[PDB]
Design a protein around this ligand. Structure first.
Ligand code: RET
Ligand code: RET
Ligand code: RET
Lengths: 214, 214, 214
């Protein structure tokens, strides 16, 4: 398994991040700041365990489609299922979202990952992209509410940069999935795991640092 | 698969509903009303994806019991797992339920569907109905709190009609399950899928319209 | 299956407990007390169904490792997944925890059980204990926040006794798991199920009585 290197590296970098975030957040008294620490640390924390699962090989399954027996890292969708709403919750709390928009974002987020999962396990190669289409659609709703649903200059300036980090990173995920072993098999799993590793550490630890250092 | 027609029809009607609900809820400023839009749209939204899963065939499994190899649409319990608490949350928010009754309803609701799931996958034909019995019991607790746990005339009148819609529809589900391919095999899967389709679109889009138009 | 006796006994004692708790909590008007009733009753309620699942045999799977085909009661982790955060939520609400510490405890709790699950299903005997190590680590964070994150004398005195009940009981779980069929196979499944049964009824009904009678 050639991509083991990017899984091992992902695991460690989610580890280093969880821990640094834990440290940095030793001391916080502020109820609000604690919240931002609870979320931000949990995210790579969970990401760590799941990257570990793929590295050790636990979160890895084969799906028969398109004549091949395709190895699919399911553990990603286990990761993403909890870490993605949490990321949205960082922005939501930041921007003082009404519970109405929180539920919407969280609800739409669950759909996104859920369809992504079903898509990933789909045995009929063509249906894979129907679920891709549904999932992407859900994605556009998030980016929608992020832009057009969502102010002290402190939160605003922090919001706009974290908002921007989200739009660009999350937009890359489907492309990878589409191009990768889940979709077209245009890029090998090796390159795909690398791209997903760059993205995840950027979308979590990267995103994380920007936040908790604000 | 003869019931494909009722799955296809279900899918479309959950689609038309999600979308109409999305539209209708373009504009809402009110924090409370947004909440009611978040929930009400999410419900058939999720229902859509799951009806799609059964139509495409993804949410369909065989369970060996009673000498046969029974096709069980598991995806229903995936649907119901999230859509049912949300329905209860519409009524709860409507009626200003204390968090105590919210947790109770949600908690009891999880049990209901969870036992329903286990029941559906049970390999010993007789145990199927033990889990049916547990699930139904949970159901009676919901209908209990709905009646005897739960006032501006606006919410009350809306509550009593939505409360009534719930009691009658949800009471039908076990009967179908008992009579259907999950339980007795008195009715064929075809008729059962139809009944479940009539119920779901009624319990979601039907229920939905009454609510958001109030 | 020799441990059937401890599963049957567990089932009944979670049953007797759910029901007594239901009764005892007929009448509560207080919003806060209701909360404490919602949680405390839900816990053995869920525990009941899951103990039933292992008794009937539904929540039982074989995992190939260390040359054997080890029967693993997975249903425990289904139980623990919801009942453990609820227990933490009893203490949290009791002690008026900020949402920051609630999320942290709940988040860390999910990790604990999740890794425990993965560990339990791990096919490489040695990795089992890596996940054991991760899970335990998560545990120490809970006991940490319980001691050093967490006052009318009423809640305090109740908190310190329930806090103590938690530390001692929950500390036993890994030891059992380590010694038992999940880990070392030092103790037979029979003895292990007994120990887990003593613990669960103590950590739930036992813990429960102390709380709702306060
Ligand atoms: C920490 C992990 C993050 C931020 C992951 C985000 C992943 C997505 C936004 C992926 C969404 C997907 C689609 C839009 C299409 C179908 C495939 C999914 C999972 C990749
Ligand atoms: C949108 C979907 C809804 C409102 C579904 C509701 C389903 C139930 C209330 C079903 C409960 C069940 C029992 C009471 C017994 C065992 C079988 C279950 C799932 C059908
Ligand atoms: C009602 C059930 C309760 C309170 C169960 C608590 C279980 C734990 C605290 C177990 C944690 C585990 C570890 C610390 C190591 C790996 C095995 C797990 C599940 C046993």
């Amino acid at each position: 398994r050639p991509e083991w290197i990017w899984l091992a590296l992902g695991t460690a970098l989610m580890g280093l991040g969880t821990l640094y975030f834990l440290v940095k957040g030793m001391g916080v008294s502020d109820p609000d700041a604690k919240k931002f620490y609870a979320i931000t640390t949990l995210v790579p924390a969970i990401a760590f365990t799941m990257y570990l699962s793929m590295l050790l090989g636990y979160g890895l399954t084969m799906v028969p489609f398109g004549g091949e027996q395709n190895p699919i890292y399911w553990a990603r969708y286990a990761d993403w299922l909890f870490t993605t709403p949490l990321l949205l919750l960082d922005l939501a709390l930041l921007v003082d979202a009404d519970q109405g928009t929180i539920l919407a974002l969280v609800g739409a987020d669950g759909i996104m990952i859920g369809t992504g999962l079903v898509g990933a396990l789909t045995k009929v190669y063509s249906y894979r992209f129907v679920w891709w289409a549904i999932s992407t659609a859900a994605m556009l709703y998030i980016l929608y509410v992020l832009f057009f649903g969502f102010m002290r200059p402190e939160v605003a300036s922090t919001f706009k940069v974290l908002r921007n980090v989200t739009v660009v990173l999350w937009s890359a995920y489907p492309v990878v999935w589409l191009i990768g072993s889940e979709g077209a098999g245009i890029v090998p799993l090796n390159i795909e795991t690398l791209l997903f590793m760059v993205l995840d550490v950027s979308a979590k630890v990267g995103f994380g640092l920007i936040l908790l250092r604000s």
